[PDB]
Amino acid sequence: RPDINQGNYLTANDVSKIRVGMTQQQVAYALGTPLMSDPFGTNTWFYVFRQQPGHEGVTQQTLTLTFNSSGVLTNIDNKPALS
Amino acid sequence: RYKRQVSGDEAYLEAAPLAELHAPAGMILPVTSGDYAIPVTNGSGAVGKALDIRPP
Amino acid sequence: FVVKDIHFEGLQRVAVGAALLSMPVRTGDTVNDEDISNTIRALFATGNFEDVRVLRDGDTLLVQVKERPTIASITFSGNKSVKDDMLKQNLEASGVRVGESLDRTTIADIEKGLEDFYYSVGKYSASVKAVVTPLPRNRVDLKLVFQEGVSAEIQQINIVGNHAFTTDELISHFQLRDEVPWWNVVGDRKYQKQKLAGDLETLRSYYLDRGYARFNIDSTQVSLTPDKKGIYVTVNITEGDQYKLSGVEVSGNLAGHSAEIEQLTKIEPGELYNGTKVTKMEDDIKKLLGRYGYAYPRVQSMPEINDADKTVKLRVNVDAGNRFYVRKIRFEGNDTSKDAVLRREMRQMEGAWLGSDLVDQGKERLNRLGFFETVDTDTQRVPGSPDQVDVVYKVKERNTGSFNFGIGYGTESGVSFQAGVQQDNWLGTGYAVGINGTKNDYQTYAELSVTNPYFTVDGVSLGGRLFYNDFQADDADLSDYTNKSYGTDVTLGFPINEYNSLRAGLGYVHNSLSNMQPQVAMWRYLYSMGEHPSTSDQDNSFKTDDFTFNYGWTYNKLDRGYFPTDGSRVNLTGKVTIPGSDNEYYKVTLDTATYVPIDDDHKWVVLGRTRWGYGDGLGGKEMPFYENFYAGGSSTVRGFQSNTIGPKAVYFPHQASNYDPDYDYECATQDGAKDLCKSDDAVGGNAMAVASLEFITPTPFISDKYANSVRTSFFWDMGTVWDTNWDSSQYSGYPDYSDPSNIRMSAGIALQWMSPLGPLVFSYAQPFKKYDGDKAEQFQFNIGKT
Amino acid sequence: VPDNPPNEIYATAQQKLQDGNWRQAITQLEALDNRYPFGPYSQQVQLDLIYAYYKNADLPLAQAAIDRFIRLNPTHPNIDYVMYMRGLTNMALDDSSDRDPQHARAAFSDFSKLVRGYPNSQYTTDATKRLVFLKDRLAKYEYSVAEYYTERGAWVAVVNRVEGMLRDYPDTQATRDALPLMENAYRQMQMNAQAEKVAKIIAANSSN
Amino acid sequence: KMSPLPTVENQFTPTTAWSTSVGSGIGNFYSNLHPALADNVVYAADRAGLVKALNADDGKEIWSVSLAEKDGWFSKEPALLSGGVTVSGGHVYIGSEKAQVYALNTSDGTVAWQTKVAGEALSRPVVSDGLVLIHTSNGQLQALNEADGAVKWTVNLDMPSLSLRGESAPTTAFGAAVVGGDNGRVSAVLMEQGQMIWQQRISQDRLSDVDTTPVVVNGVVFALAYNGNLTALDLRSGQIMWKRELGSVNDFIVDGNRIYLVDQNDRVMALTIDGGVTLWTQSDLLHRLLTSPVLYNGNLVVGDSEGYLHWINVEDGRFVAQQKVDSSGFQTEPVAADGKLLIQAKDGTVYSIT
């Protein structure tokens, strides 16, 4: 079937321009709007870069960004793959 | 077309009531939006064929 | 001005409340002229009124008004070529309909509008005149008087400034026409801007592909005779001389993928300039930048002309855009076809980054279904977002229930009727259901079919078939027997390559053989089945029930389904009996078609067709004779009568059913038959091989203006059929029907084109090598589906 | 239609409406409304025309009657009826779930306006029930898309929609059925930390 | 509908001095191609590319020559001659739909010169000031040298999206060519190098106006347009003096102090030159697709679609004669000079009329 593509495109370089202590607008400006957040209690930018060509399986890096009460980057979690 | 002649007729329904979802501890359900929200209009009028939809 | 009261005059349909609601000024307000002007043009903006006056009474504010006249009737007079109801349908959409009112400023626009429609369908002399009759109580009846007139036609397509090519041979590739032969379906001679638009581009590409990089269209005049019945198209051009491709030069906000784009734009220098390879690059780069997330990559290319060498340097401006993300893929207008039925044909994913082309692929793949009349895309920016978007497809659903009736004529089966009732979108589920029938000389076929194109999410289909086939061997120019058969099939067909597709299915069949004139080969198979009937009485009846596993491989890489000039088609179909079946055999069929062009213009083509067939029994039984292979005929080995190639019957002496002279029989005892009889009528075989070497060429006498609609072919056909269970030892006096060395051959001409009657294909063939018994049929034809 | 005086034609159309033969009523009324468009009780006719249209299942003609009636008369006593009928007219086109939900939405709108503007109306209580239906219906439409994309392989697309459902139709049966697809959707992208919460939302609530 | 065939008692009774045939002629194609008379000889032709010279009293053939280029015995391509014929200075000028203008020798029919132009040379070539003026289907007003046919200069008029089948042959006065335009405008240009003087618009879905042949007298140009007004322009400024709401594309004659034109819908009338006041009007040949009117022996002669020649009195608009002369029909213009009344049916058949 056609190639399944899901989430945000992450250029692996755009991930460099982001460092802890940023407001949501800068990350948003440097990574675009996140397709998904956490809609339950907390607030966390979910940047999934999922792509799946047919009969080749999924390649996926997950860039999870945790902001504090005041909408400022406190945690930068990068998973460049899965197993 | 032919399906509408059945609705324009009189057929009625009684479907899934509305039950509010609980919120576990250490989290919360998302926001209300409020677009699709039905007020509690009190009382009883005739419903489903019992109601006279003839023009007053 | 203190307003202590608002008073109305002239209100009839519009009640006080609506007017009073509409006004900015209100009772108790202090008013200036501004607030009155606003009020006036507020009242005017409700669509309810024609003239309005808001004036000051002593203390009161008086709103005077006259309402628009209420349409009570819409009548139609002179509209020969348009349904009153459809014409009404357009009108209620545009704005005018009974119950509503008439803006007396728009009658002109109504007239011009309908008149515009008529202009946009051919009749430029068309005149629509709206007569408006008043009635009491501010009512009105509007009668539309139509003077349609004659539709115009293109008296000429002309091209000036062409020296490298004849005008006609350029018009040969066009959509618009100036000639339309009675025997050709070359297209109509009606005019629409879109055709011209396409023709310009075709004309452009024609030159651009042959190296005319400086080719330009200077202008295009559409002339029109004063009598409004004649149309002339002139397209003026400037053909600059030819050019070799110097090289490619990339420059723009490449997004840093300049390392990869050099590979896309590699070229062999000294290659004649080609406008399609360019476009291919332009889209390749655009595809790459699309793969990397960018929604709308732009690639533009201009040729830098170097007259000295006469070699063009291709200057490519890339302009990679931004990334966007599809929040939603929406569907509206699908009032009967479920959402999942539209959403499957998507190539753009929800909750993923955007691909401008992937949004169009979903549009085309929505068109291909034939489920919708019109289908359009709309890309809407999400409110308050710099990169999020909703893609919305708007569909207009079409009735897919169909009555179909066809009719064909061919030397292979005379007249042939097809007829059926069809529904390709059953209840808006994507299921296709049909009850269909076919009828020719030697058989009648009737089937009921239900199929699901997406039993798997990825395009694997689910087949279901219930059938009835009545077959009469005599009419098929074979030895006599009757096969009435019924049964059912279920089949999976999975896609794999867009050029290749596979299928596999389970099928149950029941054949009731009857009325078989006793011959050796046929009976040999009956003994294999444990059945031993009378050899002197064709009063016989044999019935079997068989379960089979069927498989198939289709491969299609033809450049064009119609008049292919390159590529190859290959079809493989195989049958095998699964234990439990009365019979025990397998069969295998392989069809090969291969087109080889040998000139750039693709008008001299070499064809190579092959057909291989082999089947056999497994458990010491034999393959049934009604599953045999044949050769000779219009579509296998021309020059020969259908099915004539192969083994011939060896009849037993028998007493005919209702014997009478005047009629001819085969080995009838009542004609003095006491021993086995050699014969001419074919029986078929379990092993078949056919091959043909055609040479396609240009048709040599029809004017180039439409000489491409007709295909000539010079062919050399070869064929053979034989029987591997044949006992040469026991039948020495008769030919060896196990020998495959008996090659039948023929050479001939074939013509192909499209008539008002349908698809035509002729063939005049001479069989220079035929073996004894073989029947010739030199002139063969075919009209429509057969 | 005969050119008899309207007082008898109304009686005629008043003895065809009761009969249940609508096409018969329509023409006789239509005569009256087309011919006499602003009598003292000519809206009383428009209402009957709307009523006849609705039952004769000529809905596009019913809508265009309603909207005219409202446009010209929004403060008339019986707009609750004329709006309730607008609701019914769209419910009729809805025909229910897998298909274009715009009609259900429009119905939702009409009935919402009805219950807001006129809560003590005769038609309010039934309208509520119809709203309860249309709610879960509109939710189910989302559930379907979620389901397809769940079959597809897109999970982002799923959780976005299940989330959307949780935002818009949290209190519907369709939404309760949808949470497992979100949990799965997370588990497929290895956002287990997020799936785990959805799991709690399920476990801490009824399937009903 | 189409108006019937007027029934009229005609004293006098006209005849046919002779009739010669050219090969197939213009066919059903709207074309300007018409006969040409000069010094007792008649030059005519067909779309196919065949030109013939004829004695103007016998209709007998002096010479005949084909201009359709052939590659061997087998191949022949039509020349599509469409604009002409014009004879002046011992040359025969004809324009091709192949964008070629041919100049033939009046003596032997030999091609003096041939020239590529800016497009379809539909217009009647007009010869003046030692130049041949061509008005091409691209609104190109070119001037070829009368001697060698070199493109001396080119003017470009803007063209609407939709046009009637052109074009407008100009009239030359005081060293300036006055031409009508598909634009709906009359443009005056200097003959020397094509200098733009003035450009006057007389135009008024698809309502437009192609012009076609204006006529100048005493510092007044007269021009006519499709469903647009008839106008008397001042020759110096091109300023509109008086108007008249009526149109046409076939030529009109100016004679005495009257004007006669053939309307859009084939109405013959008589206007005053000073103010365009209508005198007499004949609506009896409506929509019969009349040809250009000509003035012959005090009568107005017009051909029509069904091949009838109509002779009408110029005093009150009464018919004076009627005649059937060819089945093919009459579309292109008659030629009425030297007392010889020539005309050409669509099948290339020329007709002397007495």
Swiss-Prot record, chain A:
It is found in: Cell outer membrane. It comes from the Bacteria. Disulfide bonds: none annotated. Keywords: Cell outer membrane, Lipoprotein, Membrane, Palmitate, Signal. It is a lipid-anchor. GO terms for molecular function: identical protein binding; protein-macromolecule adaptor activity. Disruption phenotype: Mutants show minor defects in the assembly of outer membrane proteins. GO terms for biological process: Gram-negative-bacterium-type cell outer membrane assembly; protein insertion into membrane; response to antibiotic. GO terms for cellular component: Bam protein complex; membrane. Part of the outer membrane protein assembly complex (Bam), which is involved in assembly and insertion of beta-barrel proteins into the outer membrane. Nonessential member of the complex that stabilizes the interaction between the essential proteins BamA and BamD. May modulate the conformation of BamA, likely through interactions with BamD. Efficient substrate folding and insertion into the outer membrane requires all 5 subunits. Belongs to the BamE family. This is Outer membrane protein assembly factor BamE. The gene is bamE.
Swiss-Prot record, chain C:
PROSITE patterns: POTRA. Pfam families: Omp85 (PF01103), POTRA (PF07244). Residues 411-412, 440-442, 473-481, 513-540, 578-585, 617-685, 723-744, 767-780 are extracellular. InterPro entries: Bac_surfAg_D15 (IPR000184), BamA/TamA_POTRA (IPR010827), D15-like (IPR039910), OM_assembly_BamA (IPR023707), POTRA (IPR034746). The chain crosses the membrane at residues 402-410, 413-423, 432-439, 443-452, 461-472, 482-483, 500-512, 541-554, 568-577, 586-596, 606-616, 686-695, 710-722, 745-754, 756-766, 781-785. Changing E412L: Very minor growth defect. Lethal. GO terms for biological process: cell adhesion; Gram-negative-bacterium-type cell outer membrane assembly; protein insertion into membrane. One of its GO terms (cellular component) is cell outer membrane. It is found in: Cell outer membrane. Residues 1-401, 424-431, 453-460, 484-499, 555-567, 597-605, 696-709, 755 are periplasmic. Changing K228A: Lethal, protein does not accumulate. Disruption phenotype: Deletion is lethal. Depletion results in the accumulation of incorrectly assembled outer membrane proteins, including TolC, OmpF, OmpC and OmpA. Decreased expression leads to decreased susceptibility to contact-dependent growth inhibition (CDI), and decreased expression of outer membrane proteins (including in this study LamB) as well as up-regulation of periplasmic protease DegP. Keywords: Cell adhesion, Cell outer membrane, Membrane, Repeat, Signal, Transmembrane, Transmembrane beta strand. Residues 1-68, 69-149, 152-240, 243-321, 324-398 form the POTRA domain. Belongs to the BamA family. This is Outer membrane protein assembly factor BamA. The gene is bamA.
UniProtKB/Swiss-Prot annotation, chain D:
One of its GO terms (cellular component) is membrane. Disruption phenotype: Depletion decreases the density of outer membrane proteins, but does not significantly affect transport of lipopolysaccharides to the outer membrane. PROSITE patterns: PROKAR_LIPOPROTEIN. SUPFAM superfamilies: TPR-like. CDD domains: BamD. It comes from the Bacteria. NCBIfam families: OM_YfiO (TIGR03302), PRK10866.1 (NF008119). PANTHER family: OUTER MEMBRANE PROTEIN ASSEMBLY FACTOR BAMD, SOLUBLE LYTIC MUREIN TRANSGLYCOSYLASE-RELATED. This is Outer membrane protein assembly factor BamD. It comes from Escherichia coli (strain K12). The gene is bamD.
Curated annotation (Swiss-Prot), chain E:
NCBIfam families: assembly_YfgL, PRK11138.1. Part of the Bam complex, which is composed of the outer membrane protein BamA, and four lipoproteins BamB, BamC, BamD and BamE. Monomer. Interacts directly with BamA. The Bam complex has the shape of a hat, with the BamA beta-barrel crown in the outer membrane and the periplasmic brim formed by the BamA POTRA domains and the 4 lipoproteins. This is Outer membrane protein assembly factor BamB. GO terms for biological process: Gram-negative-bacterium-type cell outer membrane assembly; protein insertion into membrane. PROSITE patterns: PROKAR_LIPOPROTEIN (PS51257). Keywords: Cell outer membrane, Lipoprotein, Membrane, Palmitate, Signal. PANTHER family: CELL SURFACE PROTEIN (PTHR34512), OUTER MEMBRANE PROTEIN ASSEMBLY FACTOR BAMB (PTHR34512:SF30). GO terms for molecular function: identical protein binding. InterPro entries: BamB, PQQ_b-propeller_rpt, PQQ_rpt_dom, Quinoprotein_ADH-like_sf, WD40/YVTN_repeat-like_dom_sf. It holds the Pfam family PQQ_2. SMART domains: PQQ (SM00564). It is a lipid-anchor. Belongs to the BamB family. One of its GO terms (cellular component) is membrane. It is found in: Cell outer membrane.
